Scaffold this active site. Structure first.
Site, PDB file in Angstrom:
ATOM      1  N   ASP A 163      33.288 -80.697  -0.684  1.00 28.53           N
ATOM      2  CA  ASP A 163      33.353 -79.255  -0.892  1.00 28.53           C
ATOM      3  C   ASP A 163      32.365 -78.539   0.019  1.00 28.53           C
ATOM      4  O   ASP A 163      31.191 -78.910   0.100  1.00 28.53           O
ATOM      5  CB  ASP A 163      33.051 -78.942  -2.361  1.00 28.53           C
ATOM      6  N   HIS A 215      36.983 -77.660  -3.006  1.00 21.67           N
ATOM      7  CA  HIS A 215      36.262 -76.647  -3.764  1.00 21.67           C
ATOM      8  C   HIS A 215      37.007 -76.228  -5.025  1.00 21.67           C
ATOM      9  O   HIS A 215      36.376 -75.730  -5.966  1.00 21.67           O
ATOM     10  CB  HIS A 215      36.017 -75.421  -2.884  1.00 21.67           C
ATOM     11  N   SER A 238      31.321 -71.804  -8.264  1.00 22.44           N
ATOM     12  CA  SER A 238      31.064 -71.149  -6.974  1.00 22.44           C
ATOM     13  C   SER A 238      30.038 -70.042  -7.201  1.00 22.44           C
ATOM     14  O   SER A 238      29.003 -70.302  -7.836  1.00 22.44           O
ATOM     15  CB  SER A 238      32.396 -70.699  -6.388  1.00 22.44           C
TER      16      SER A 238
HETATM   17  C1  LIG Z   1      33.244 -69.058  -4.864  1.00 19.52           C
HETATM   18  O1  LIG Z   1      32.845 -68.414  -3.857  1.00 19.52           O
HETATM   19  C2  LIG Z   1      34.628 -68.798  -5.455  1.00 19.52           C
HETATM   20  C3  LIG Z   1      35.673 -69.077  -4.383  1.00 19.52           C
HETATM   21  C4  LIG Z   1      36.990 -69.485  -5.030  1.00 19.52           C
HETATM   22  C5  LIG Z   1      38.019 -68.403  -4.722  1.00 19.52           C
HETATM   23  C6  LIG Z   1      38.890 -68.240  -5.963  1.00 19.52           C
HETATM   24  C7  LIG Z   1      40.146 -69.092  -5.835  1.00 19.52           C
HETATM   25  C8  LIG Z   1      41.268 -68.227  -5.285  1.00 19.52           C
HETATM   26  C9  LIG Z   1      38.668 -68.322  -3.382  1.00 19.52           C
HETATM   27  C10 LIG Z   1      39.472 -67.274  -2.616  1.00 19.52           C
HETATM   28  C11 LIG Z   1      38.960 -65.879  -2.954  1.00 19.52           C
HETATM   29  C12 LIG Z   1      39.449 -64.823  -1.966  1.00 19.52           C
HETATM   30  C13 LIG Z   1      38.729 -64.946  -0.629  1.00 19.52           C
HETATM   31  C14 LIG Z   1      38.847 -63.665   0.188  1.00 19.52           C
HETATM   32  C15 LIG Z   1      38.058 -63.782   1.489  1.00 19.52           C
HETATM   33  C16 LIG Z   1      37.839 -65.242   1.877  1.00 19.52           C
HETATM   34  C17 LIG Z   1      38.064 -65.448   3.372  1.00 19.52           C
HETATM   35  C18 LIG Z   1      37.884 -66.907   3.790  1.00 19.52           C
HETATM   36  C19 LIG Z   1      38.305 -67.873   2.686  1.00 19.52           C
HETATM   37  C20 LIG Z   1      38.716 -69.243   3.229  1.00 19.52           C
HETATM   38  C21 LIG Z   1      40.085 -69.203   3.903  1.00 19.52           C
HETATM   39  C22 LIG Z   1      40.249 -70.313   4.929  1.00 19.52           C
HETATM   40  C23 LIG Z   1      39.518 -69.954   6.203  1.00 19.52           C
HETATM   41  C24 LIG Z   1      38.788 -69.684  -2.708  1.00 19.52           C
HETATM   42  C25 LIG Z   1      38.819 -69.525  -1.192  1.00 19.52           C
HETATM   43  C26 LIG Z   1      37.422 -69.523  -0.584  1.00 19.52           C
HETATM   44  C27 LIG Z   1      37.230 -70.729   0.327  1.00 19.52           C
HETATM   45  C28 LIG Z   1      35.971 -70.546   1.160  1.00 19.52           C
HETATM   46  C29 LIG Z   1      34.834 -70.041   0.282  1.00 19.52           C
HETATM   47  C30 LIG Z   1      33.555 -69.939   1.102  1.00 19.52           C
HETATM   48  C31 LIG Z   1      32.301 -69.994   0.233  1.00 19.52           C
HETATM   49  C32 LIG Z   1      32.287 -68.956  -0.885  1.00 19.52           C
HETATM   50  C33 LIG Z   1      30.866 -68.479  -1.081  1.00 19.52           C
HETATM   51  O2  LIG Z   1      30.363 -68.401  -2.192  1.00 19.52           O
HETATM   52  O3  LIG Z   1      30.079 -68.107   0.081  1.00 19.52           O
HETATM   53  C34 LIG Z   1      28.794 -68.685   0.297  1.00 19.52           C
HETATM   54  C35 LIG Z   1      27.857 -67.612   0.838  1.00 19.52           C
HETATM   55  O4  LIG Z   1      26.499 -68.057   0.739  1.00 19.52           O
HETATM   56  C36 LIG Z   1      28.207 -67.315   2.295  1.00 19.52           C
HETATM   57  O5  LIG Z   1      27.475 -68.179   3.162  1.00 19.52           O
HETATM   58  C37 LIG Z   1      27.372 -67.855   4.578  1.00 19.52           C
HETATM   59  O6  LIG Z   1      26.303 -68.000   5.152  1.00 19.52           O
HETATM   60  C38 LIG Z   1      28.589 -67.346   5.314  1.00 19.52           C
HETATM   61  C39 LIG Z   1      29.407 -68.525   5.821  1.00 19.52           C
HETATM   62  C40 LIG Z   1      30.767 -68.068   6.331  1.00 19.52           C
HETATM   63  C41 LIG Z   1      31.602 -69.273   6.741  1.00 19.52           C
HETATM   64  C42 LIG Z   1      30.807 -70.165   7.688  1.00 19.52           C
HETATM   65  C43 LIG Z   1      31.707 -71.212   8.333  1.00 19.52           C
HETATM   66  C44 LIG Z   1      31.382 -72.621   7.849  1.00 19.52           C
HETATM   67  C45 LIG Z   1      30.359 -73.300   8.755  1.00 19.52           C
HETATM   68  C46 LIG Z   1      30.788 -74.722   9.104  1.00 19.52           C
HETATM   69  C47 LIG Z   1      31.955 -74.709  10.087  1.00 19.52           C
HETATM   70  C48 LIG Z   1      32.949 -75.827   9.791  1.00 19.52           C
HETATM   71  C49 LIG Z   1      32.867 -76.939  10.830  1.00 19.52           C
HETATM   72  C50 LIG Z   1      32.406 -78.241  10.186  1.00 19.52           C
HETATM   73  C51 LIG Z   1      32.694 -79.453  11.069  1.00 19.52           C
HETATM   74  C52 LIG Z   1      31.410 -80.055  11.634  1.00 19.52           C
HETATM   75  C53 LIG Z   1      31.552 -81.555  11.877  1.00 19.52           C
HETATM   76  C54 LIG Z   1      31.702 -81.888  13.348  1.00 19.52           C
END
Ligand SMILES: *C(=O)CCC[C@H](CCC)[C@H](CCCCCCCCCCCCCC)CCCCCCCCCC(=O)OC[C@@H](O)COC(=O)CCCCCCCCCCCCCCCCC
Ligand SMILES: CCCCCCCCCCCCCCCCCCCCCCCCC(=O)OC[C@@H](O)COC(=O)CCCCCCCCCCCCCCCCC
Ligand SMILES: CCCCCCCCCCCCCCCCCCCCCCCCC(=O)OC[C@@H](O)COC(=O)CCCCCCCCCCCCCCCCC
Ligand SMILES: CC(=O)N[C@@H]1[C@@H](O)[C@H](O)[C@@H](CO)O[C@H]1O
Ligand SMILES: CC(=O)N[C@@H]1[C@@H](O)[C@H](O)[C@@H](CO)O[C@H]1O
Ligand SMILES: *[C@@H]1O[C@H](CO)[C@@H](O)[C@H](O)[C@H]1NC(C)=O
Ligand SMILES: CCCCCCCC(=O)O
Ligand SMILES: *C(=O)CCCCCCC
Ligand SMILES: [Ca+2]
Ligand SMILES: [Ca+2]
Ligand SMILES: [Ca+2]
Lengths: 269, 269, 269
Positions: free
Chosen positions: A201, A258, A146
């Site tokens: 993912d 992921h 990640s």
């Molecule tokens: C890498 O980032 C390490 C992550 C792994 C860790 C460690 C394991 C525990 C975590 C949890 C850490 C604690 C998180 C605390 C805050 C997180 C809040 C939200 C987390 C998800 C909960 C459920 C809602 C594992 C959990 C993380 C899962 C999600 C990780 C997101 C990505 C991490 C990252 O690196 O961010 C990327 C950046 O570049 C940010 O990018 C952005 O532009 C911001 C985007 C914000 C979310 C946008 C929403 C997604 C858009 C698509 C919508 C879905 C609809 C699709 C369907 C369409 C078809 C019709």
């Protein structure tokens, strides 16, 4: 399909990336053994692998990980932890593109990722190059899951070209920059980038293309499901900048996907 | 429909679960009154309920809650806090199945939940059994919401059979193990498990059946809506391992439903 | 379309809101200059703006922000920070409607936001009115992004009518109360409320109407996309209680749109 030799590397460094999340591996005394909780990194534990440098709360964005010396596999492994802290997450959201012309011409990278790396690059370069000097027969590898995979990629692009190859293994990593950068990472010499992804993912689909981000080629796409053991026939190499048909498909993304890269990554306390 | 006596029990231990989230109830002097903020646990406050033991950041996974002496209802109440901290959430994401043969044969449970309980089991068993000795006519009750209900469910299974009954009241708990553990939780002697779900709350649907997880029987399903008062005519008992037609339905899940179990739960600061 | 003058104010106080997120702007010594990192608040830095008061971890719910003295624009600015801490997010989830008869009869407000403001009202009211005494020629402005905007809105309603006008600028604020409160916020005198939204930002759609929440009028709606610069022609004034056709449309919401209000906001470390 991939070769069994490459599958073994993909599995090994997935466990080095998992080990970086274990809190005990971020403030450990130099020279001590690398271990994990549960079965998070059994291949790392089996090796004669020790800490050269264990770091946490470093630079800007809470840069966290360890530099490891692996005498069994003859490796110098720099492993970045992925997101865990609030500070990690604020840095992920600084997704405006910043200039990185010192790295490649016309390239732009994620502000957060590049600012985190830049804040620790002088310290970590020196330690990597000290190890290379003492162990010239060892292979240098940057890796991370990640956010950590994004940091490994940037650091690798920045430090290559100084006499020793640097291979990068990134797992579930987000896009790190613009098309110029994605092309540079595709053709850069002095090491190979292995960009690994798993089914649907979500994280390798961020930040979205619309914000100006692209992915380097190739992509190694794990097709096996979550909690399903990976075999070398479940991994497909996909060539082409911003190629589709791998992780980059217009379907519904998945969060647990992921966390399963050969095993559980990101869950070590 | 349930009886008015059971409904009153369901309502009282929902407020004991709610109380566990209040930070002041995780580090209180023994003997002092249990209170909440803004009507979170009015029935607990009315009662002569005082702290026997309050804990926070215990073991692995940030185990949090309190042990209460209730003289009004003649209860020894162990209340586990649900998810609040990052450490809590990381533990939840440790969702591969681990052997819990020492609890029941053939059984496998959520790795995070069982590791969190194992890491506090000796301390909390001593506290509970001390209280039992001191008040041998009181009723022992384990309770919790979400992660707290999963810990209460695993704790009760582990500690039953040592001379006293343990009743468990879980609210919005996730699945905690495989089918064998689900059957054991259905049939175990020495106390009763009241597993309570609300409309289409997503949490009792996690981890999905496809990861190897099953729900114990019965299920007490609250059919009234979010922010809607519950009456005893809104609760339906549903029997059968992995029964459908209650919370376990193939419709769209909901997150706010998770916070409404007779009242707001999970929100006390 | 808005006037260039109003556009300049919208841009300025978005930057005051962005500044509240920088950690160094929550424990700054009085009389020191207000600065941000990563070009988060250039217009605030250009101004002769200093701290009158800087707070963090205040009251209940982790109220955080600063009170500023702007000698260039002749402003007393109270800027609340939006959600960054776990405690902030838990306060957001306290979404049941509580009577606020001390503001208006029949009015009800988000429990969390109103509890948080109540817990700091006396202190901050005194700080503001001290500043008005010292600089009676200046203009009092409350502002904030997201949760901070909800706090600025409640605070302005509570403190208006004591001899000095209070203008409120909120950016991506959630709904804060029921329809009675929304109508009061629309007709209250003693200052103007500028409620600014961006495209399909999800936060101004929360909490949902179905829980009894309504929006005040008018709405200033930014139609230009995320990462796109805003001009005065990209902002649409939309009149009407719970008016549709601006941010309140029946389309798919967006999370990254919540972070782009003239610039990146919520991302200052
Ligand atoms: C890498 O980032 C390490 C992550 C792994 C860790 C460690 C394991 C525990 C975590 C949890 C850490 C604690 C998180 C605390 C805050 C997180 C809040 C939200 C987390 C998800 C909960 C459920 C809602 C594992 C959990 C993380 C899962 C999600 C990780 C997101 C990505 C991490 C990252 O690196 O961010 C990327 C950046 O570049 C940010 O990018 C952005 O532009 C911001 C985007 C914000 C979310 C946008 C929403 C997604 C858009 C698509 C919508 C879905 C609809 C699709 C369907 C369409 C078809 C019709
Ligand atoms: C189509 C696009 C679909 C997008 C993805 C779906 C929406 C994502 C919303 C969150 C879902 C996460 C699912 C991961 C499954 C992990 C997973 O499989 O494990 C879950 C675990 O077994 C049980 O977890 C818990 O005890 C709590 C469940 C929460 C998970 C989902 C969030 C709901 C609860 C919200 C509480 C938030 C506030 C708490 C306080 C601190 C914060
Ligand atoms: C059941 C029927 C109701 C429909 C479900 C409504 C909820 C749909 C989405 C679930 C979100 C929980 C809201 C619960 C809920 O009712 O509370 C909404 C609350 O007022 C939100 O207010 C806030 O200020 C915080 C926003 C929370 C989500 C926004 C995330 C933005 C992330 C940006 C990064 C921050 C750094
Ligand atoms: C504290 C500890 O267990 N240290 C071990 C050591 O006992 C073992 O001989 C060595 C083998 O690699 O790894 C390390
Ligand atoms: C408030 C306090 O400090 N202690 C109270 C006590 O006054 C009261 O008589 C008793 C009845 O439940 O509960 C406890
Ligand atoms: C702060 O800015 C003001 C002028 O606006 C002045 O006091 C001084 O130049 C600055 N002080 C510091 C410490 O930067
Ligand atoms: C806030 C409520 C979160 C606790 C739910 C479980 O986990
Ligand atoms: C209020 O809760 C809005 C949250 C601000 C987002 C910060 C940067 C993502
Ligand atoms: Ca070893
Ligand atoms: Ca009492
Ligand atoms: Ca200045």
């Amino acid at each position: 399909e991939v070769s069994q030799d490459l599958f073994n590397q993909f599995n090994l460094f997935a466990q080095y990336s998992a080990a970086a999340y274990c809190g005990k591996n971020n403030d450990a005394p130099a020279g001590t053994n690398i271990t994990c909780t549960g079965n998070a990194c059994p291949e790392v534990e089996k090796a004669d692998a020790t800490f050269l440098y264990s770091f946490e709360d470093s630079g800007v964005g809470d840069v966290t990980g360890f530099l490891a010396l692996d005498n069994t596999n003859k490796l110098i492994v720099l492993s970045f932890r992925g997101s865990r802290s609030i500070e990690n997450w604020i840095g992920n959201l600084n997704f405006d593109l910043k200039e990185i012309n010192d790295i490649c011409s016309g390239c732009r990278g994620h502000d957060g990722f590049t600012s985190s790396w830049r804040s620790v690059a002088d310290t970590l370069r020196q330690k990597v190059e000290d190890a290379v000097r003492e162990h010239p027969d060892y292979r240098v590898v940057f890796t991370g899951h990640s956010l950590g995979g994004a940091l490994a990629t940037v650091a690798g692009a920045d430090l290559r070209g100084n006499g020793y190859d640097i291979d990068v293994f990134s797992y579930g990593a987000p896009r790190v920059g613009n098309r110029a950068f994605a092309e540079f990472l595709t053709v850069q010499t002095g090491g190979t980038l292995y960009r690994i992804t798993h089914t649907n993912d979500i994280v390798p689909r961020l930040p979205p293309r619309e914000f100006g981000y692209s992915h380097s080629s190739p992509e190694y796409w794990i097709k096996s499901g979550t909690l399903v053991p990976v075999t070398r026939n479940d991994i497909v190499k996909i060539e082409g900048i911003d190629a589709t048909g791998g992780n980059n498909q217009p379907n519904i993304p998945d969060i647990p996907a992921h966390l399963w890269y050969f095993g559980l990554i990101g869950t070590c306390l």
